[PDB]
């Protein structure tokens, strides 16, 4: 199940990064709305996004 694999991948990330990716990508919050939602700065959300995609890319590639 594709969503099953997705959740297993997401479970590889820190909670905060999972939350950010779900909010930005699946739900569709902007970076600003996401930062407001999770009590961060937009800058912090951008950094977390970068760190998340890199960890994901690592897993997918390997």
């Amino acid at each position: 199940d594709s969503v099953t694999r997705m959740n297993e991948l997401l479970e590889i990330l820190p909670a905060k990064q999972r939350e950010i990716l779900i909010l930005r990508v699946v739900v569709g919050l902007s970076a600003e709305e996401t930062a407001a939602a999770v009590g961060s700065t937009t800058g912090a959300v951008r950094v977390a996004q970068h760190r998340a995609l890199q960890r994901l890319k690592d897993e997918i590639v390997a």
Side-chain angles (χ1 to χ4, degrees):
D1 183 285
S2 294
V3 167
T4 285
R5 271 168 256 161
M6 176 201 187
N7 284 310
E8 293 187 10
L9 279 159
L10 290 186
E11 283 192 284
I12 244 67
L13 302 175
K16 171 136 300 179
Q17 291 176 17
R18 291 164 63 182
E19 167 180 46
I20 283 166
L21 291 191
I22 296 170
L23 289 180
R24 293 282 284 112
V25 173
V26 175
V27 175
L29 274 52
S30 68
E32 311 89 66
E33 296 176 313
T34 291
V38 307
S40 279
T41 51
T42 305
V45 166
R46 284 185 217 109
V47 173
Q49 285 176 353
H50 284 298
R51 296 201 187 297
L53 297 200
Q54 184 60 248
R55 287 172 126 292
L56 295 174
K57 182 178 176 304
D58 283 354
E59 290 293 329
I60 299 164
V61 173

Tab-separated table of all heavy atoms in Angstrom:
chain	number	residue	atom	x	y	z
A	1	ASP	N	0.841	-1.193	0.000
A	1	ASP	CA	0.000	0.000	0.000
A	1	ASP	C	0.883	1.251	0.000
A	1	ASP	O	1.714	1.433	0.892
A	1	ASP	CB	-0.942	-0.018	1.208
A	1	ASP	CG	-1.905	1.161	1.226
A	1	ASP	OD1	-1.458	2.278	1.553
A	1	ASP	OD2	-3.106	0.972	0.923
A	2	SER	N	0.705	2.097	-1.012
A	2	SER	CA	1.532	3.292	-1.191
A	2	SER	C	1.511	4.263	-0.002
A	2	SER	O	2.533	4.879	0.322
A	2	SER	CB	1.128	4.029	-2.467
A	2	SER	OG	1.423	3.251	-3.607
A	3	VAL	N	0.352	4.419	0.630
A	3	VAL	CA	0.236	5.299	1.796
A	3	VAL	C	0.928	4.663	2.996
A	3	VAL	O	1.534	5.352	3.813
A	3	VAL	CB	-1.224	5.609	2.152
A	3	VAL	CG1	-1.301	6.241	3.543
A	3	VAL	CG2	-1.843	6.531	1.109
A	4	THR	N	0.855	3.339	3.079
A	4	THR	CA	1.575	2.587	4.101
A	4	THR	C	3.084	2.828	4.020
A	4	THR	O	3.731	3.071	5.036
A	4	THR	CB	1.276	1.076	3.998
A	4	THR	OG1	-0.037	0.814	4.517
A	4	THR	CG2	2.306	0.266	4.778
A	5	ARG	N	3.638	2.754	2.812
A	5	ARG	CA	5.056	3.029	2.595
A	5	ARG	C	5.373	4.473	2.968
A	5	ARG	O	6.371	4.755	3.628
A	5	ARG	CB	5.446	2.774	1.133
A	5	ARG	CG	5.898	1.350	0.815
A	5	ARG	CD	5.967	1.118	-0.700
A	5	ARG	NE	4.841	0.324	-1.196
A	5	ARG	CZ	4.449	0.284	-2.467
A	5	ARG	NH1	5.083	1.005	-3.384
A	5	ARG	NH2	3.417	-0.474	-2.824
A	6	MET	N	4.523	5.391	2.525
A	6	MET	CA	4.686	6.793	2.887
A	6	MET	C	4.771	7.024	4.387
A	6	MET	O	5.594	7.804	4.853
A	6	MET	CB	3.530	7.632	2.364
A	6	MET	CG	3.661	9.063	2.840
A	6	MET	SD	1.952	9.981	2.783
A	6	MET	CE	2.558	11.784	3.237
A	7	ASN	N	3.887	6.384	5.148
A	7	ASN	CA	3.888	6.602	6.586
A	7	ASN	C	5.138	6.013	7.236
A	7	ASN	O	5.685	6.588	8.182
A	7	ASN	CB	2.601	6.064	7.219
A	7	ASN	CG	1.412	6.972	6.969
A	7	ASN	OD1	1.486	8.182	7.191
A	7	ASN	ND2	0.313	6.397	6.494
A	8	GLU	N	5.610	4.886	6.706
A	8	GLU	CA	6.842	4.266	7.199
A	8	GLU	C	8.049	5.167	6.942
A	8	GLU	O	8.916	5.313	7.801
A	8	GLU	CB	7.046	2.873	6.590
A	8	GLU	CG	5.999	1.855	7.040
A	8	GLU	CD	6.301	0.440	6.577
A	8	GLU	OE1	7.419	0.204	6.072
A	8	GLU	OE2	5.420	-0.437	6.723
A	9	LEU	N	8.086	5.787	5.765
A	9	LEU	CA	9.095	6.793	5.461
A	9	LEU	C	8.981	7.988	6.405
A	9	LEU	O	9.968	8.406	7.000
A	9	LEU	CB	8.973	7.267	4.012
A	9	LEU	CG	9.606	6.383	2.944
A	9	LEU	CD1	8.984	6.671	1.587
A	9	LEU	CD2	11.122	6.589	2.909
A	10	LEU	N	7.780	8.538	6.535
A	10	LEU	CA	7.581	9.691	7.411
A	10	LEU	C	8.004	9.363	8.841
A	10	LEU	O	8.522	10.225	9.545
A	10	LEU	CB	6.131	10.160	7.380
A	10	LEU	CG	5.663	10.814	6.079
A	10	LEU	CD1	4.269	11.355	6.268
A	10	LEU	CD2	6.616	11.925	5.646
A	11	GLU	N	7.797	8.118	9.264
A	11	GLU	CA	8.155	7.710	10.627
A	11	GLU	C	9.668	7.742	10.850
A	11	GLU	O	10.145	7.556	11.965
A	11	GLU	CB	7.587	6.324	10.964
A	11	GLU	CG	6.101	6.319	11.289
A	11	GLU	CD	5.639	5.007	11.905
A	11	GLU	OE1	5.490	4.012	11.162
A	11	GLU	OE2	5.426	4.971	13.136
A	12	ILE	N	10.410	7.984	9.772
A	12	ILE	CA	11.859	8.103	9.815
A	12	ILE	C	12.287	9.522	10.239
A	12	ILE	O	13.400	9.729	10.729
A	12	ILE	CB	12.446	7.769	8.419
A	12	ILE	CG1	13.321	6.518	8.476
A	12	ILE	CG2	13.156	8.973	7.805
A	12	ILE	CD1	12.540	5.253	8.773
A	13	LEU	N	11.387	10.487	10.054
A	13	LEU	CA	11.647	11.901	10.335
A	13	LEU	C	11.296	12.267	11.771
A	13	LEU	O	10.463	11.607	12.392
A	13	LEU	CB	10.774	12.777	9.423
A	13	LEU	CG	10.909	12.616	7.913
A	13	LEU	CD1	9.869	13.482	7.192
A	13	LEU	CD2	12.329	12.972	7.495
A	14	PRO	N	11.906	13.350	12.288
A	14	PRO	CA	11.449	13.938	13.555
A	14	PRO	C	9.981	14.312	13.420
A	14	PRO	O	9.538	14.692	12.327
A	14	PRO	CB	12.292	15.211	13.680
A	14	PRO	CG	13.495	14.960	12.838
A	14	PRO	CD	13.035	14.093	11.703
A	15	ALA	N	9.236	14.199	14.516
A	15	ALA	CA	7.824	14.528	14.527
A	15	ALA	C	7.524	15.866	13.849
A	15	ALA	O	6.569	15.983	13.086
A	15	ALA	CB	7.300	14.532	15.976
A	16	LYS	N	8.340	16.874	14.135
A	16	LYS	CA	8.075	18.227	13.658
A	16	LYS	C	8.140	18.310	12.138
A	16	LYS	O	7.379	19.040	11.511
A	16	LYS	CB	9.072	19.209	14.279
A	16	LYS	CG	9.018	20.603	13.684
A	16	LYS	CD	9.074	21.662	14.768
A	16	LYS	CE	7.895	21.518	15.716
A	16	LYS	NZ	7.919	22.517	16.821
A	17	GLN	N	9.062	17.557	11.560
A	17	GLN	CA	9.224	17.532	10.119
A	17	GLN	C	8.067	16.772	9.465
A	17	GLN	O	7.600	17.157	8.400
A	17	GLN	CB	10.582	16.926	9.742
A	17	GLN	CG	11.774	17.812	10.127
A	17	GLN	CD	13.122	17.159	9.837
A	17	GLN	OE1	13.210	16.194	9.084
A	17	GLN	NE2	14.177	17.686	10.445
A	18	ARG	N	7.593	15.702	10.099
A	18	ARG	CA	6.443	14.972	9.563
A	18	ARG	C	5.244	15.896	9.510
A	18	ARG	O	4.531	15.975	8.510
A	18	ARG	CB	6.098	13.768	10.438
A	18	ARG	CG	7.122	12.659	10.406
A	18	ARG	CD	6.920	11.687	11.568
A	18	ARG	NE	5.629	11.005	11.500
A	18	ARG	CZ	5.200	10.137	12.416
A	18	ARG	NH1	5.962	9.861	13.469
A	18	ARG	NH2	4.013	9.552	12.289
A	19	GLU	N	5.033	16.595	10.618
A	19	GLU	CA	3.935	17.518	10.759
A	19	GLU	C	3.993	18.600	9.687
A	19	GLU	O	2.994	18.913	9.041
A	19	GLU	CB	4.025	18.138	12.155
A	19	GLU	CG	3.155	19.327	12.371
A	19	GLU	CD	3.319	19.867	13.774
A	19	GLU	OE1	4.480	20.010	14.230
A	19	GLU	OE2	2.287	20.124	14.420
A	20	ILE	N	5.180	19.169	9.488
A	20	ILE	CA	5.361	20.217	8.477
A	20	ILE	C	5.059	19.717	7.064
A	20	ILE	O	4.341	20.371	6.302
A	20	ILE	CB	6.790	20.845	8.570
A	20	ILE	CG1	6.823	21.807	9.753
A	20	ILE	CG2	7.156	21.564	7.291
A	20	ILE	CD1	8.237	22.237	10.154
A	21	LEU	N	5.598	18.558	6.705
A	21	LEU	CA	5.374	18.031	5.355
A	21	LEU	C	3.903	17.722	5.115
A	21	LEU	O	3.375	18.025	4.046
A	21	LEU	CB	6.218	16.785	5.085
A	21	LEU	CG	7.733	16.988	4.981
A	21	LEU	CD1	8.405	15.718	4.434
A	21	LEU	CD2	8.034	18.169	4.059
A	22	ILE	N	3.240	17.117	6.101
A	22	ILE	CA	1.808	16.840	5.949
A	22	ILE	C	1.014	18.135	5.742
A	22	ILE	O	0.179	18.224	4.831
A	22	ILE	CB	1.250	16.022	7.112
A	22	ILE	CG1	1.905	14.639	7.163
A	22	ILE	CG2	-0.258	15.874	6.991
A	22	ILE	CD1	1.547	13.870	8.457
A	23	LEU	N	1.280	19.136	6.579
A	23	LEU	CA	0.619	20.447	6.477
A	23	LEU	C	0.866	21.173	5.143
A	23	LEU	O	-0.082	21.679	4.511
A	23	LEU	CB	1.014	21.332	7.665
A	23	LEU	CG	0.422	20.915	9.028
A	23	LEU	CD1	0.881	21.866	10.145
A	23	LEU	CD2	-1.117	20.861	8.989
A	24	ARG	N	2.127	21.221	4.711
A	24	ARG	CA	2.485	21.916	3.478
A	24	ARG	C	1.987	21.181	2.241
A	24	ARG	O	1.519	21.805	1.294
A	24	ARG	CB	4.010	22.054	3.343
A	24	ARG	CG	4.655	22.961	4.356
A	24	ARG	CD	4.454	24.426	3.971
A	24	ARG	NE	5.336	24.849	2.880
A	24	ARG	CZ	4.927	25.176	1.655
A	24	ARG	NH1	3.636	25.128	1.331
A	24	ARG	NH2	5.816	25.550	0.742
A	25	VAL	N	2.152	19.864	2.223
A	25	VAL	CA	2.005	19.110	0.973
A	25	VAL	C	0.606	18.532	0.834
A	25	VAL	O	-0.060	18.766	-0.161
A	25	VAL	CB	3.041	17.996	0.855
A	25	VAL	CG1	2.746	17.135	-0.374
A	25	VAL	CG2	4.451	18.602	0.770
A	26	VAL	N	0.153	17.807	1.850
A	26	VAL	CA	-1.144	17.136	1.786
A	26	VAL	C	-2.286	18.096	2.026
A	26	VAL	O	-3.266	18.123	1.273
A	26	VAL	CB	-1.233	15.979	2.782
A	26	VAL	CG1	-2.653	15.374	2.788
A	26	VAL	CG2	-0.203	14.930	2.426
A	27	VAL	N	-2.163	18.897	3.073
A	27	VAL	CA	-3.218	19.839	3.406
A	27	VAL	C	-3.101	21.110	2.575
A	27	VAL	O	-4.104	21.681	2.163
A	27	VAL	CB	-3.208	20.191	4.889
A	27	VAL	CG1	-4.244	21.262	5.164
A	27	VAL	CG2	-3.472	18.943	5.722
A	28	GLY	N	-1.877	21.560	2.337
A	28	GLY	CA	-1.660	22.657	1.409
A	28	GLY	C	-1.460	24.016	2.048
A	28	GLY	O	-1.555	25.036	1.355
A	29	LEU	N	-1.189	24.039	3.356
A	29	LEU	CA	-0.806	25.279	4.035
A	29	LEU	C	0.436	25.861	3.368
A	29	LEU	O	1.295	25.124	2.883
A	29	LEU	CB	-0.498	25.036	5.515
A	29	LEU	CG	-1.674	25.071	6.489
A	29	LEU	CD1	-2.784	24.153	6.040
A	29	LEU	CD2	-1.223	24.727	7.884
A	30	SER	N	0.517	27.186	3.337
A	30	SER	CA	1.717	27.861	2.881
A	30	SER	C	2.759	27.741	3.977
A	30	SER	O	2.457	27.291	5.085
A	30	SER	CB	1.431	29.341	2.635
A	30	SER	OG	1.175	29.995	3.867
A	31	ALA	N	3.985	28.160	3.679
A	31	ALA	CA	5.043	28.121	4.673
A	31	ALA	C	4.670	29.000	5.864
A	31	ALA	O	4.947	28.646	7.012
A	31	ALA	CB	6.365	28.557	4.065
A	32	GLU	N	4.031	30.136	5.586
A	32	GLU	CA	3.673	31.089	6.631
A	32	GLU	C	2.557	30.544	7.512
A	32	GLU	O	2.591	30.679	8.740
A	32	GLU	CB	3.246	32.430	6.022
A	32	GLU	CG	4.199	32.978	4.962
A	32	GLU	CD	3.868	32.495	3.554
A	32	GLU	OE1	2.794	32.873	3.031
A	32	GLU	OE2	4.681	31.747	2.964
A	33	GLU	N	1.560	29.937	6.876
A	33	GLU	CA	0.432	29.359	7.597
A	33	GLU	C	0.882	28.175	8.442
A	33	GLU	O	0.388	27.963	9.554
A	33	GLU	CB	-0.665	28.935	6.615
A	33	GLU	CG	-1.290	30.103	5.856
A	33	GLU	CD	-2.311	29.658	4.830
A	33	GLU	OE1	-2.012	28.718	4.064
A	33	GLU	OE2	-3.414	30.244	4.795
A	34	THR	N	1.834	27.411	7.912
A	34	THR	CA	2.388	26.271	8.626
A	34	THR	C	3.136	26.726	9.876
A	34	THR	O	2.942	26.175	10.960
A	34	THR	CB	3.334	25.464	7.720
A	34	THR	OG1	2.565	24.826	6.697
A	34	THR	CG2	4.058	24.406	8.515
A	35	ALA	N	3.984	27.737	9.726
A	35	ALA	CA	4.709	28.287	10.866
A	35	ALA	C	3.734	28.783	11.939
A	35	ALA	O	3.947	28.563	13.132
A	35	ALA	CB	5.638	29.416	10.427
A	36	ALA	N	2.671	29.456	11.514
A	36	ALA	CA	1.642	29.898	12.460
A	36	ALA	C	0.985	28.689	13.118
A	36	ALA	O	0.750	28.678	14.323
A	36	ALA	CB	0.602	30.754	11.759
A	37	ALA	N	0.703	27.657	12.327
A	37	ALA	CA	-0.004	26.492	12.851
A	37	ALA	C	0.810	25.758	13.916
A	37	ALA	O	0.271	25.304	14.924
A	37	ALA	CB	-0.395	25.541	11.724
A	38	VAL	N	2.111	25.653	13.695
A	38	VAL	CA	2.952	24.828	14.547
A	38	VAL	C	3.806	25.624	15.539
A	38	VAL	O	4.626	25.049	16.252
A	38	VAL	CB	3.868	23.942	13.700
A	38	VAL	CG1	3.042	23.160	12.675
A	38	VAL	CG2	4.919	24.784	13.017
A	39	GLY	N	3.623	26.939	15.573
A	39	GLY	CA	4.369	27.784	16.489
A	39	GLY	C	5.858	27.850	16.191
A	39	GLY	O	6.681	27.623	17.081
A	40	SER	N	6.205	28.149	14.939
A	40	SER	CA	7.599	28.348	14.533
A	40	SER	C	7.731	29.640	13.749
A	40	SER	O	6.779	30.409	13.638
A	40	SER	CB	8.089	27.194	13.649
A	40	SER	OG	8.463	26.066	14.418
A	41	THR	N	8.917	29.875	13.198
A	41	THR	CA	9.089	30.937	12.227
A	41	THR	C	9.012	30.325	10.841
A	41	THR	O	9.168	29.116	10.682
A	41	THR	CB	10.447	31.645	12.385
A	41	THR	OG1	11.497	30.673	12.416
A	41	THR	CG2	10.483	32.459	13.671
A	42	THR	N	8.771	31.157	9.838
A	42	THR	CA	8.763	30.688	8.462
A	42	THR	C	10.153	30.161	8.091
A	42	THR	O	10.290	29.143	7.411
A	42	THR	CB	8.363	31.819	7.508
A	42	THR	OG1	7.107	32.365	7.925
A	42	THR	CG2	8.237	31.303	6.090
A	43	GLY	N	11.182	30.860	8.559
A	43	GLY	CA	12.556	30.429	8.364
A	43	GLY	C	12.804	29.046	8.932
A	43	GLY	O	13.445	28.221	8.291
A	44	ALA	N	12.296	28.783	10.133
A	44	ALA	CA	12.460	27.466	10.736
A	44	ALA	C	11.720	26.397	9.915
A	44	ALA	O	12.209	25.288	9.744
A	44	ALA	CB	11.975	27.471	12.182
A	45	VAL	N	10.546	26.740	9.402
A	45	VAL	CA	9.779	25.798	8.583
A	45	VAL	C	10.545	25.486	7.290
A	45	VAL	O	10.659	24.333	6.900
A	45	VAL	CB	8.360	26.326	8.282
A	45	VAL	CG1	7.707	25.509	7.161
A	45	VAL	CG2	7.487	26.289	9.548
A	46	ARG	N	11.104	26.509	6.647
A	46	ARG	CA	11.925	26.280	5.459
A	46	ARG	C	13.122	25.360	5.731
A	46	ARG	O	13.411	24.464	4.947
A	46	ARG	CB	12.423	27.602	4.872
A	46	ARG	CG	11.387	28.397	4.097
A	46	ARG	CD	12.045	29.640	3.465
A	46	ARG	NE	11.152	30.792	3.485
A	46	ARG	CZ	11.317	31.856	4.264
A	46	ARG	NH1	12.359	31.934	5.081
A	46	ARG	NH2	10.443	32.852	4.217
A	47	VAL	N	13.826	25.590	6.835
A	47	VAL	CA	14.964	24.741	7.197
A	47	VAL	C	14.559	23.303	7.461
A	47	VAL	O	15.205	22.370	6.986
A	47	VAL	CB	15.680	25.278	8.449
A	47	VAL	CG1	16.754	24.304	8.906
A	47	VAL	CG2	16.274	26.633	8.156
A	48	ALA	N	13.485	23.129	8.229
A	48	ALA	CA	12.942	21.802	8.491
A	48	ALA	C	12.537	21.087	7.200
A	48	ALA	O	12.681	19.874	7.090
A	48	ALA	CB	11.727	21.915	9.432
A	49	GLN	N	11.985	21.835	6.245
A	49	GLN	CA	11.602	21.266	4.942
A	49	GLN	C	12.832	20.719	4.248
A	49	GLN	O	12.845	19.580	3.793
A	49	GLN	CB	10.966	22.340	4.049
A	49	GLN	CG	9.553	22.698	4.463
A	49	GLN	CD	8.972	23.827	3.625
A	49	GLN	OE1	9.661	24.440	2.803
A	49	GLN	NE2	7.704	24.097	3.825
A	50	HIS	N	13.871	21.541	4.200
A	50	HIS	CA	15.140	21.140	3.589
A	50	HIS	C	15.702	19.885	4.250
A	50	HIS	O	16.081	18.931	3.566
A	50	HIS	CB	16.159	22.280	3.648
A	50	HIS	CG	15.903	23.367	2.652
A	50	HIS	ND1	15.927	23.150	1.290
A	50	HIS	CD2	15.631	24.684	2.818
A	50	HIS	CE1	15.673	24.284	0.660
A	50	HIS	NE2	15.489	25.231	1.564
A	51	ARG	N	15.751	19.874	5.580
A	51	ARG	CA	16.283	18.715	6.294
A	51	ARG	C	15.440	17.467	6.015
A	51	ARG	O	15.971	16.367	5.842
A	51	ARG	CB	16.337	18.987	7.794
A	51	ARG	CG	17.294	20.128	8.146
A	51	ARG	CD	17.735	20.091	9.587
A	51	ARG	NE	18.519	21.276	9.946
A	51	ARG	CZ	19.689	21.606	9.400
A	51	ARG	NH1	20.229	20.850	8.453
A	51	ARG	NH2	20.320	22.704	9.802
A	52	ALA	N	14.124	17.645	5.977
A	52	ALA	CA	13.220	16.523	5.709
A	52	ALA	C	13.400	15.924	4.321
A	52	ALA	O	13.479	14.710	4.169
A	52	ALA	CB	11.766	16.939	5.910
A	53	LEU	N	13.427	16.764	3.294
A	53	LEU	CA	13.529	16.233	1.937
A	53	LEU	C	14.849	15.493	1.739
A	53	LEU	O	14.916	14.503	1.002
A	53	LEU	CB	13.373	17.337	0.900
A	53	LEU	CG	12.015	18.037	0.897
A	53	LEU	CD1	11.798	18.732	-0.424
A	53	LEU	CD2	10.898	17.046	1.162
A	54	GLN	N	15.894	15.971	2.406
A	54	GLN	CA	17.198	15.337	2.299
A	54	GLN	C	17.196	13.941	2.929
A	54	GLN	O	17.740	12.998	2.345
A	54	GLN	CB	18.294	16.211	2.918
A	54	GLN	CG	19.693	15.640	2.752
A	54	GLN	CD	20.074	15.476	1.292
A	54	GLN	OE1	20.225	14.357	0.794
A	54	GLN	NE2	20.219	16.594	0.594
A	55	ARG	N	16.596	13.808	4.111
A	55	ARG	CA	16.478	12.506	4.767
A	55	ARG	C	15.619	11.575	3.916
A	55	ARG	O	15.956	10.411	3.722
A	55	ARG	CB	15.855	12.629	6.171
A	55	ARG	CG	16.749	13.231	7.241
A	55	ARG	CD	15.931	13.479	8.521
A	55	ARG	NE	16.510	12.874	9.723
A	55	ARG	CZ	16.589	11.564	9.953
A	55	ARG	NH1	16.148	10.692	9.054
A	55	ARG	NH2	17.128	11.121	11.083
A	56	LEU	N	14.511	12.095	3.400
A	56	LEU	CA	13.650	11.293	2.545
A	56	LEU	C	14.387	10.867	1.289
A	56	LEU	O	14.318	9.706	0.893
A	56	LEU	CB	12.392	12.065	2.157
A	56	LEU	CG	11.503	12.368	3.369
A	56	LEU	CD1	10.363	13.251	2.943
A	56	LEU	CD2	10.989	11.060	3.956
A	57	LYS	N	15.063	11.812	0.645
A	57	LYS	CA	15.765	11.483	-0.586
A	57	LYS	C	16.765	10.366	-0.294
A	57	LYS	O	16.848	9.400	-1.043
A	57	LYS	CB	16.471	12.702	-1.175
A	57	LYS	CG	17.179	12.427	-2.509
A	57	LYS	CD	17.830	13.702	-3.059
A	57	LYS	CE	18.639	13.430	-4.342
A	57	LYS	NZ	19.661	12.378	-4.122
A	58	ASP	N	17.509	10.497	0.801
A	58	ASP	CA	18.451	9.453	1.226
A	58	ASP	C	17.797	8.068	1.254
A	58	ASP	O	18.321	7.112	0.656
A	58	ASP	CB	19.024	9.757	2.624
A	58	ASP	CG	20.109	10.838	2.600
A	58	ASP	OD1	20.494	11.280	1.498
A	58	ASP	OD2	20.588	11.230	3.686
A	59	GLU	N	16.672	7.964	1.969
A	59	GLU	CA	15.957	6.696	2.145
A	59	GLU	C	15.499	6.140	0.814
A	59	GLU	O	15.709	4.965	0.517
A	59	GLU	CB	14.725	6.863	3.045
A	59	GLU	CG	15.034	7.118	4.494
A	59	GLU	CD	15.696	5.927	5.184
A	59	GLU	OE1	15.418	4.769	4.803
A	59	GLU	OE2	16.490	6.160	6.120
A	60	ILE	N	14.867	6.989	0.014
A	60	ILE	CA	14.333	6.557	-1.276
A	60	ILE	C	15.429	6.048	-2.193
A	60	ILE	O	15.307	4.975	-2.792
A	60	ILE	CB	13.570	7.689	-1.977
A	60	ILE	CG1	12.386	8.125	-1.125
A	60	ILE	CG2	13.084	7.230	-3.358
A	60	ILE	CD1	11.810	9.466	-1.522
A	61	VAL	N	16.510	6.818	-2.293
A	61	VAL	CA	17.653	6.439	-3.116
A	61	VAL	C	18.270	5.114	-2.658
A	61	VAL	O	18.484	4.209	-3.461
A	61	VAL	CB	18.746	7.517	-3.101
A	61	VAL	CG1	19.973	7.016	-3.834
A	61	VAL	CG2	18.241	8.798	-3.731
A	62	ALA	N	18.563	5.006	-1.367
A	62	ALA	CA	19.105	3.768	-0.820
A	62	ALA	C	18.079	2.636	-0.892
A	62	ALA	O	16.876	2.860	-0.726
A	62	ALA	CB	19.571	3.978	0.612
